[PDB]
Nucleic acid binder design. Structure first.
Ligand SMILES: [Mg+2]
Ligand SMILES: [Mg+2]
Ligand SMILES: [Mg+2]
Ligand SMILES: [Mg+2]
Ligand SMILES: [Mg+2]
Ligand SMILES: [Mg+2]
Ligand SMILES: [Mg+2]
Ligand SMILES: [Mg+2]
Ligand SMILES: [Mg+2]
Ligand SMILES: [Mg+2]
Lengths: 322, 332, 322, 321
DNA sequence: CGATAACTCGTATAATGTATGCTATACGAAGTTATC
DNA sequence: GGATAACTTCGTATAGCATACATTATACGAAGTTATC
DNA sequence: CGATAACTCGTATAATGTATGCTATACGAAGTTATC
DNA sequence: GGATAACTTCGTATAGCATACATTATACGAAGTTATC
């Protein structure tokens, strides 16, 4: 149509209104779909119910995850609705097939995974293992971890911290102002406070790295093979890198990741959030305080991130034995 | 399956849509299918008896039927199910849904208000708390009957792990393992959710472990790691392991009913619900014990795989630790 | 329009889908709106936006309260929307004049009032003062005042408690189950617990009134001049009666009220609700607990019912006067 | 066509909005019409495509997301009240606004608040004016005492009159605040001054002689000589009261920076912020803090005390034990 | 110099809040089957 | 050939749990890119 | 049979959340108007 | 006469307060009612 093409360019025009990752994915999915449509001879747009149905069944067949499969379907939906046409999910065949695949895969045993926990226990060990190392890069990494566990911020969030977003409490603790997270985009943002210990781990890095010479410099920067920080206010350390710190720190204590092709074999971006949640639950922290901690507003996820004490567990075991 | 999509009535994209729905019938739980079919039956029967066309449903008839269910004394939650299944049957066949019609919406609201105003209130399982497990145990631990040994292990596990019966019935021998402490660890695979908060694994206490260990020793379920932990035990006191057939949740529910009968006698005369323990009695009782013990809410919800604080608060509302700010203020 | 009359017939057929009070006021406003329309040759339905404007000004002129005028417009709005027709408030004429009337009256000095508090201070007096009486009347009224202050339940709610709705905590405190309230109509309801002391006051009344003969009997009932209680399971004590209990208790300690003709010169139904709100406030109870106490979800009315200390006062004064 | 009729009715019931509202409406409208007649765009009815360009312009001019929101807002009010469809309902506009906000928050744009005028400050300021016979000082030292002690907002301060003052059993002053622009003024009808502040306010009431007439606004103008000019037909302007804050701040820290930054020196809300902050360190419950200053939005008070240590959170506690 | 430490891409998949629609349990009773 | 313990199936009544929706992140091996060694 | 304690009804006005639309402050600067 | 102190009046850039919406409940003085005294 014409109004359709219009609504599309209007979406593309102000494509900044959406996330970079959202577009990265709309595209990725669109190629995948286009490819399949072609190799199967189907009009990829508008997408017809039965075609999106065979297509999802196809992805299921390729052994992809339910979340993965919902993503393509999801993106196809965004493309159509946003353009003014009905959603392929607005059709019985697509909406029902999607339900079916979830149920079928779940039953066959599939289940969503989640970052391996990086809990308090681990932090201490890692700290009493790098606490000294004058190595300018060990200084950095030990601060990252400290901040990641203390604030539960997501990596992409830590990466965007500038030196100017730091302040303090009359008590001497640091306040890192976070402006944009995955769930909030406001000019009011939020303030995450660090403890006396971690605020310390961060101060040492701020000097050693000399990132503080310009308030607009991102807090964390890359350190080259000679051991020299490269402060900057244009380029922030990549999330791929922040994930690396977790992998490296994990390898530094457990060594080579058991080549099994599986994810979460070592710590990663989210390892600190799940870990931190788990540490609060055990500590008896309340539901509202655990939400403030990770910027959540629903008990769920915190619940997913839990399957606490394994061995001699607790709670009912502690209650029964006494 | 369904009553009978009228050759005339049923027509066009509805026979089409209806077909698509059976094509992907795996998109809904079998229990969901059980209730859909029950409601249609129920509605089709009312329709014949009252000379009404059962499909598509006219709003004015669905309203009459809804007031009909109310007069039968059914609960608002039940009435809601019937409307719900009728809405699904319709939406999924491409037609408007009742309750989307002004009359049906207004009558549902009226029925709900009138009913609440008549004193109708939701119920919950009679709790089977720690103090019940102890009494029940002090009595059954001395029995050699294979049945009593099995039933006492079930109770221990039910109370210790807070698992749903459907889940206990699925446990197979190989899903058990030992811990450093010498206590059992039960692993629960295959749920229904991708985010199974329940807990992949549940640890049994030392006491409960001994109880399960004794059932395994006397039933010989260990003869095959694929046997389900719980099986039948017949008239002659002989267990019957199997790896293809698990105990029916009905039977487990029977163990709670029977264990309550053993101690308190036959059930009351009214046809009241929850006059004896059922398959949720342990979960409710455990939540209450943990609360009384001071366990945190997140820690309680984690213990039983809950996700809706509203339900756990429902289970511990009558505890004194939940009386409020005014009571505190008055009693200082 | 066939549709309009069919929508109206639907509503009147299931009028019981709304509060009896909602119906009571709909009818009041309509007749009032019918009278004016006739005395001015105006079509009363569907109402014309320019006429509703006039009518709302006529009410302002009549010197009625901002809320009273909002109620009138409010019903005329409902009548129409529920008809399938647009609402008078959908017109700039009515929309703006309603903001204006409020704005004006507010400046002119009109303020929304609220019940005279019945705080712990008074309950303690009223109790020590009636606590010894053996008169059924006195015994009943003390129990009512006790529940009213302890639970913050609205009179309508209290008037509905049947003896079967009472249970006890393992500790011994009474628990009253409430099914319906101004803002909740469910089969789940909520439980309102009483203090060891108040449960006493209610126990004494139960035994002396004989309402426990039938679990279906309403907890409170009439008490004739002969001092004898007349329990019932069909008729409940009037909310007017409950109001009278507040008025009566307030005369017993302050004699007749002013000749002002003003509302709230004595305690009324809501008196305990605002009173207890205030006491909790002064005790430092948290926002979530103060809300759990009075069935609120936002903070507005709590903040409304507040004005606390005025003499030495506290807050900033205590703070300043080091 | 009928928009004229619509516009008429809006002007007919113009009392339906505050003076400050019409001000921004007219102001924003001028900015709009200007931009248009300089880009050749019918300024009204505004086409979504045009408004979009305009909004992008306000962004390029460097304004805040909040300010941009005000323009779009007033623009909407105009149309809605004229019977026309508001520009926010158009995809183009709603899309740019999402873009602008994300782009700006991402650029580091932060919302600011007044500079805290806490207790310590109220003491310093006093011990440096406490002993002074400067007719002006006496006034300004009292305005601060009240502002801090009552958490009242300047417009309110400016409206107090001797008629509205009374005495407590303890002999403290009790300012009665009436006609507050709100039907549900969940803030209070009476505020009590402390013994200390009562003294200060008294000292000003005599030296100013505003007590000569009851309708006399507690606070008045004071000429370049040291003579209070009481009145009951005109009140000290809010701008002036603001200044009193600025002035007292300059008196202690000098002048501001070149950076046209906002909130470099105390201002109207500086009292509330600090007032809120002190009560918090004391341990005053949120509701008790909220009512003390007439607050009804817990997020606001939470903003004022966010940087306090007592609000650092569960993880900090957990890491320190 | 070339070799290295230390850091853009694309497909795959987790996350984020929650009314309410789907999904369990409740439980009397009919149906089964191996044992008395 | 019964009667019966102990299930299993069934169908309807009700309690309770979890996901569709629309984006927005992370996961991670494999390439590509620089300043150092 | 009265007199009386203790209890329908109709108009008037309060109470229920809260996203966001209206309101108020911020502040440089330009007019004012009595003192210096 | 000229130069200010100390303000007003202003326009616009921003922060923050509270209300529309759709019912649902209470206020309270009167008139009506019914056992009792
Ligand atoms: Mg079923
Ligand atoms: Mg018990
Ligand atoms: Mg049994
Ligand atoms: Mg038994
Ligand atoms: Mg029992
Ligand atoms: Mg309204
Ligand atoms: Mg309608
Ligand atoms: Mg969402
Ligand atoms: Mg039998
Ligand atoms: Mg509401």
């Amino acid at each position: 149509s014409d109004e359709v093409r219009k609504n599309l360019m209007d979406m593309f025009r102000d494509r900044q209104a959406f996330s970079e990752h959202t577009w990265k994915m709309l595209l990725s999915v669109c190629r995948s779909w286009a490819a399949w449509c072609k190799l199967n001879n189907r009009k990829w747009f508008p997408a017809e119910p039965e075609d999106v149905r065979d297509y999802l069944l196809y992805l299921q067949a390729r052994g992809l995850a339910v979340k993965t499969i919902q993503q393509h379907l999801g993106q196809l939906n965004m493309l159509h609705r946003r353009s003014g046409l009905p959603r392929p999910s607005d059709s019985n065949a697509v909406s029902l097939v999607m339900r079916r695949i979830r149920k079928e895969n779940v039953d066959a045993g599939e289940r969503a995974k989640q970052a391996l926990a990086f809990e308090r226990t681990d932090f201490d060990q890692v700290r009493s293992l790098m606490e000294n190392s004058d190595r300018c890069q060990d200084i950095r990494n030990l601060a990252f971890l400290g901040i990641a566990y203390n604030t539960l911020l997501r990596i992409a969030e830590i990466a965007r911290i500038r030196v100017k977003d730091i302040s303090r409490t009359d008590g001497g603790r640091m306040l890192i102002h976070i402006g944009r997270t995955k769930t909030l985009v406001s000019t009011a943002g939020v303030e995450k406070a660090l403890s006396l210990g971690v605020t310390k781990l961060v101060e040492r890095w701020i000097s050693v790295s000399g990132v503080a010479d310009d308030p607009n410099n991102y807090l964390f920067c890359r350190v080259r093979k000679n051991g020299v920080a490269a402060p900057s206010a244009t380029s922030q350390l990549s999330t791929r890198a922040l994930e690396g710190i977790f992998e490296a720190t994990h390898r530094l204590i457990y060594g080579a990741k058991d080549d099994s092709g599986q994810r979460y074999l070592a710590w990663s971006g989210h390892s600190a959030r799940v870990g931190a949640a788990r540490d609060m639950a055990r500590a008896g922290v309340s539901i509202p305080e655990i939400m403030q901690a990770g910027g959540w507003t629903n008990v769920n996820i915190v619940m997913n991130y839990i399957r606490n004490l394994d061995s001699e567990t607790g709670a009912m075991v502690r209650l029964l034995e006494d």
